[PDB]
Amino acid sequence: LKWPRDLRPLAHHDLLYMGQISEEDRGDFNATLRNFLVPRVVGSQKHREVREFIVRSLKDLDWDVEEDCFDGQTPHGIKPFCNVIATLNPSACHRLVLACHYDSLLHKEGTFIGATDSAVPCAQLLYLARSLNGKLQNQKTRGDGLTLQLVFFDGEEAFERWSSHDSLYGSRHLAQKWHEDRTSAERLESCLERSEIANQIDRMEVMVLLDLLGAENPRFYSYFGETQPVYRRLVNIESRLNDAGLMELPRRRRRTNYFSNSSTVGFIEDDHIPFLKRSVPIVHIIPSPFPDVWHTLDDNEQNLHHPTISNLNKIFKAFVSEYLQL
């Protein structure tokens, strides 16, 4: 079946512009990232400070920001959780949703930063909102029924052994909340003609979930045939950026190959699961294999690979620009 929205290839001018990273761009991203490179344990002061920083950053950009807060039972007793949902144009029927988790694992061995997991994704979402703000604010005026939404999930990590009941606290909560919140196309602005809207979850046109990003040479695959048309845009954008010589490589005459033009047989549990189960199309931007530092105390700032992060930022900026026709 065809994707419900016609995907217009990015004009060369826009590809080149989105594929630019200046010294001011690097500095802004790095300043943003520094705010996340702290332990973010559920219920802790630093976790609250990170949430407040996300919320303030997006409110300052004139986004609608909801703090979806609740208490949930865990193997460590009752815990507070707060998802952050930022929506550029609340009234727009359809949302391109970009997401990640902002909590960090309570690690048995000691202080755990979770730099890839998911401090970098968090910073990338805020960087997108900041770097594209002018274009996003212009797009919001169009009345085209499409907008950008950023979701920062709380409580992705298990407190003890990962299980259906101990993991994905924020995403399970939000998916259920939105699924049970009934609405219809008539209540919303400019829904696509053949849309079936019965609840808030139906407004998530596609959820692009970023996780475990920041290590060198990640390998992505299309995890869902349903979103192959969207995934293939990431493949294409990466190819075009390489052809134009806009990717950072350590030697001349190399290419990045992050987005494999294949699917893989791999089952990964993550914040998309509660949405997938409710028919939200998913693009899961998570590497396979996971970074070598995964869930070790070495998942820290110095083990990040900055040229890779820069390259990913170019792909993501170009992707959002293409999808929203910025």
Closest CA to 19 of 232, 242, 199: 242
Closest CA to 208 of 138, 124, 108, 106: 124
Distance CA 201, CA 217 (A): 33
Whether the CB-CB separation of 46 and 102 falls below 8 Å is answered with: no
Question: How are beta strands 204-210 and 282-285 bridged, if at all?
Answer: parallel
Q: Of 68, 103, 154, 211, which is the active-site residue? A: 211
301 marked ligand binding residue: no
Q: What are phi and psi of 35, to 5 degrees?
A: -65, -25
Counting the structural domains of the chain, the total is 1
DSSP string computed for 191-236: --TT---SBGGGGEEEEEEE-S--SSS--EEE--GGGHHHHHHHHH
CA distances for 179 relative to 87, 164, 173, 193, 255, angstroms: 17, 19, 10, 21, 42
Q: Enumerate the β-bridge partners of residue 79.
A: 72
Q: What are phi and psi of 165, to 5 degrees?
A: -95, -20
Distance CA 326, CA 324 (A): 5
165 marked ligand binding residue: no
Distance CA 18, CA 236 (A): 14
Q: What are phi and psi of 248, to 5 degrees?
A: -85, 115
Whether the CB-CB separation of 32 and 126 falls below 8 Å is answered with: yes
Give catalytic status of residue 60 as yes or no: no
Distance CA 112, CA 39 (A): 6
Q: Of 156, 202, 271, 299, which is the active-site residue? A: 156
Distance CA 213, CA 288 (A): 11
Q: Which domain holds residue 78?
A: 1-326
Whether the CB-CB separation of 83 and 174 falls below 8 Å is answered with: yes
299 marked ligand binding residue: no
Look up residue 41 and give its two tokens.
Answer: 């344990």
Experimental approach taken: X-ray
Residues 6+ positions from 81 with CB-CB distance below 8 Å:
42, 69, 70, 71, 72, 154, 155, 169, 170, 173
User: Is 265 in a helix, a strand, or coil?
Assistant: coil
Residue 112's CATH number:
3.40.630.10
Give catalytic status of residue 144 as yes or no: no
Distance CA 304, CA 262 (A): 26
Closest CA to 218 of 147, 315, 141, 150: 315
User: What angle in degrees, to the nearest 10, is found between the helix axes of 120-131 and 45-59?
Assistant: 20
Closest CA to 106 of 47, 55, 51, 163: 47
